[PDB]
Amino acid sequence: QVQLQQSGAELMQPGASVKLSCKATGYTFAGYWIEWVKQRPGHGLEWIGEILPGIGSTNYNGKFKGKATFTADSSSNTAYMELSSLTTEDSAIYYCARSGAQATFAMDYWGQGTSVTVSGASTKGPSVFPLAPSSKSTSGGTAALGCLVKDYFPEPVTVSWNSGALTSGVHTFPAVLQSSGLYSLSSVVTVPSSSLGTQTYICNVNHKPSNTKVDKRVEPK
Amino acid sequence: DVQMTQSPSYLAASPGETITINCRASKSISKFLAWYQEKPGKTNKLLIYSGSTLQSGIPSRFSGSGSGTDFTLTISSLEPEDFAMYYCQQHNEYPYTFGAGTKLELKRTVAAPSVFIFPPSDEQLKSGTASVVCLLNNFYPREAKVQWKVDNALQSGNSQESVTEQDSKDSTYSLSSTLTLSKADYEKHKVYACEVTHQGLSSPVTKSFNRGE
Amino acid sequence: DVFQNETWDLFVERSKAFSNCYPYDVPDYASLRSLVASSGTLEFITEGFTWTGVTQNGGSNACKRGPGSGFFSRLNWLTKSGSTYPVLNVTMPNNDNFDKLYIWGIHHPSTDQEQTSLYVQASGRVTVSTRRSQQTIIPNIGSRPWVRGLSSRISIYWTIVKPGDVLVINSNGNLIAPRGYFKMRTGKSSIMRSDAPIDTCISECITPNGSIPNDKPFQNVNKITYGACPKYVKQNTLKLATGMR
Amino acid sequence: DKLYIWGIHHPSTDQEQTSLYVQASGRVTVSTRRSQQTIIPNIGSRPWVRGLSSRISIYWTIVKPGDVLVINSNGNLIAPRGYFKMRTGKSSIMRSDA
Ligand SMILES: *[C@@H]1O[C@H](CO)[C@@H](O)[C@H](O)[C@H]1NC(C)=O
Incomplete structure (x- = not known):
């Protein structure tokens, strides 16, 4: 029974500072290194630094010398990393990991990963639009019918089809960040061609951070 | 600063077989390499450390080898759970560095996409901007490529593409792409077409649509 | 740090004086204090020690040099590399014409796990020697009273190198290395405790x-x-007769 | 000031050390805020004295008001039962058969 549990997600404006936290349970927190790693798409895992909480000995990667600053509270067995002067490039998941001579300093336990999103975009509810099937040909066995959610921030947007009654062949493509600073996302289902003439397919979406609820129907043409 | 390359960046396999994953360092790191597993929904896990020492609790089907600048990890008798992401890390020179990682899939067969194209509904066009959508569904491999044409005029730069998170339920993928234009040009431009090519197909697949349908 | 390279004919210590860095103890504190006071200078010359395969410039939370962690400015806290702490075997000849005073130390971790975390070896060893003399210190891993957030310690030792003699530092862990030497002198300098x-x-x-x-x-x-x-x-009183009966 | 008298046991043989103390080698540390002392027991045979080839090495620690004593040991500890109340005065000692 040993684990590291981190803080929740963070939504920061550029130029701000955020203190990520990592509580450790199941061992002598003062004796082992707590190592902070950065992960983001494409770049992969990137080692930020480490701290020996008992001593306070801090040791950083050169690329994060001024960006990060480790701290430790031994009373609560909690390590902290203060990311300062946030920029869009800092948007990433951050892991705290246990390290010691037991595993020859390979990280034998990890936190769940705290996500940080840096963006100057204001909170916004989505625009929800339909994606009609049978653009030119009426019947093609089964056709895909979709619902596009656009111009929303922050993530996530929770989608369902026919109030969750439709689940076969449902695929939701994770969101895409546009140059405007807002997110976009697509959801789609596969439906029989004949059903277009007698059935209605409706996308239900909730943008929870503003609680924007939208129902939007879809049909050919 | 020890840079690395972990190969192959993409590994396609099926349960029950045995495989090896390569890691190479910019310079010597003696024996100090570690192999980690990442899968969604829970913490990353340490598989191997010091190149060839098995971490406690890990099944023995994981086993590392190598030294100096060349290292490998053998994964034997692939269980369905073993299909996750894997990283190699050095802990010889201080600034610990990780490889870009590898993706390990399962049930490795071939399947062709279903390729569709959709118009921007009128509520898109009342915004003053038209955004056409092109879709590919249930395909493998993930070597799909997308392409656009307007009035048989080729387009690029004014468009974008995106992919699903690779499925573990069926390991077949889908792709959504978008093209942006002004409403004024949209009104006069009647034909839109989206073309694609796939590793599992013998010819490019082009779909097209016109006003009024 | 305001006292760097200072010189004196009488160093005056105040009763209010305190230590605000890593907790340390000097075996034979009086001898070091007396010889430094008699030297009369803190003139420190940095030397190019080549600490290979280890992390230099270690620090601690207790010793805040600036916005964050720090350490003694005249000492170098060596720490393991990524996963190794080689047997440091450095040397420094005294080709100069004066005695060199090297101040070094040995780290005493609070726990075995802390020792292994800072230094790969389960037990450390420091040896500092000249042609004639030698000193070897074995770190003791145990918990001391909480001082400025720390249960560990640093034991400070000193070595004096005569002209022509050579210093050798051989360690396998727990070395608080020197960054150089203090130029020793002979003269009228001394030290005194006074609140005046x-x-x-x-x-x-x-x-x-x-x-x-x-x-x-x-x-x-x-x-x-x-x-x-x-x-x-x-x-x-002692009255001397500067007169007659 | 509190005067604590403690000690470290020196067994004659390795087997004796392991029998009295599970660890093959002992360690005693007695410290205050400033001072510290650590003793490593030496396992070896000394001259037969009153039926014993082992020894006890006696050490002392003085604790000032406000200071705190810490005793950390993994074996071979001859612990104190308390402290002797120190005083300052005219007392002394002398060797005499008179
Ligand atoms: C102290 O003096 C020495 C020369 O004796 C010089 O090398 C060193 O840089 C000086 N240090 C400071 C802080 O001025």
Whole structure:
């Protein structure tokens, strides 16, 4: 029974500072290194630094010398990393990991990963639009019918089809960040061609951070 | 600063077989390499450390080898759970560095996409901007490529593409792409077409649509 | 740090003085204090020690040099590399014409796991030697009283290298290395404990109770003296007849 | 000031050490805020004295008001039962058969 549990997600404006936290349970927190790693798409895992909480000995990667600053509270067995002067490039998941001579300093336990999103975009509810099937040909066995959610921030947007009654062949493509600073996302289902003439397919979406609820129907043409 | 390359960046396999994953360092790191597993929904896990020492609790089907600048990890008798992401890390020179990682899939067969194209509904066009959508569904491999044409005029730069998170339920993928234009040009431009090519197909697949349908 | 490269004929220590860095203890503290005071200078010359395969410039939370962690400016806290702490075997010859005073130390971690975390080896060892002399220190891993957030310690030792002699530092862990040497001198310098203020005035004699005139041959102020002070005597008064009956 | 008298046991043989103390080698540390002392027991045979080839090495620690004593040991500890109340005065000692 040993684990590291981190803080929740963070939504920061550029130029701000955020203190990520990592509580450790199941061992002598003062004796082992707590190592902070950065992960983001494409770049992969990137080692930020480490701290020996008992001593306070801090040791950083050169690329994060001024960006990060480790701290430790031994009373609560909690390590902290203060990311300062946030920029869009800092948007990433951050892991705290246990390290010691037991595993020859390979990280034998990890936190769940705290996500940080840096963006100057204001909170916004989505625009929800339909994606009609049978653009030119009426019947093609089964056709895909979709619902596009656009111009929303922050993530996530929770989608369902026919109030969750439709689940076969449902695929939701994770969101895409546009140059405007807002997110976009697509959801789609596969439906029989004949059903277009007698059935209605409706996308239900909730943008929870503003609680924007939208129902939007879809049909050919 | 020890840079690395972990190969192959993409590994396609099926349960029950045995495989090896390569890691190479910019310079010597003696024996100090570690192999980690990442899968969604829970913490990353340490598989191997010091190149060839098995971490406690890990099944023995994981086993590392190598030294100096060349290292490998053998994964034997692939269980369905073993299909996750894997990283190699050095802990010889201080600034610990990780490889870009590898993706390990399962049930490795071939399947062709279903390729569709959709118009921007009128509520898109009342915004003053038209955004056409092109879709590919249930395909493998993930070597799909997308392409656009307007009035048989080729387009690029004014468009974008995106992919699903690779499925573990069926390991077949889908792709959504978008093209942006002004409403004024949209009104006069009647034909839109989206073309694609796939590793599992013998010819490019082009779909097209016109006003009024 | 305001006292770097300072020199004195009398160093005055105040009772209010305190330590605000890593907790340390000096075996034979009096000897080091006395010889440094007699030297009369803190003139420090950095030397190009080539600490190979280890992390230099270690620090601690207790010793805040600036916005964050720090350490003694005249000491170098060596720490393991990524996963190794080689057997450091550095050397430094004294080709100069004066004695070199090297101040070094040995780290005492609170716990075995802490020792292994800072230094890969379960037990450390420091050896500092010259052609004739040698000193070896074995770190002791145990918990000391909480001081400034730390249960560990640093034991400070010193080595003096004569001209032509050579220093050798061989360690396998727990080495608080030197960054250089203090230029030793011989002269009138000393040290004194006093809370008295310092003023702009002339006096050939100094005592913890303050400067005193030295015209009289004896004094009853204090037995601690510096300069051309009168000889201490227990008598409060001694009237000499500068006249007749 | 509190005067604590403690000690470290020196067994004659390795087997004796392991029998009295599970660890093959002992360690005693007695410290205050400033000072510290650590003793490593030496396992070896000394001259037969009153039926014993082992020894006890006696050490002392003085704790000032406000200071705190810490005793950390993994074996071979001859612990104190308390402290002797220190005083300052005219007391002394002398060797005499008179
Ligand atoms: C102290 O003096 C020495 C020369 O004796 C010089 O090398 C060093 O840089 C000086 N240090 C400071 C802080 O001025």
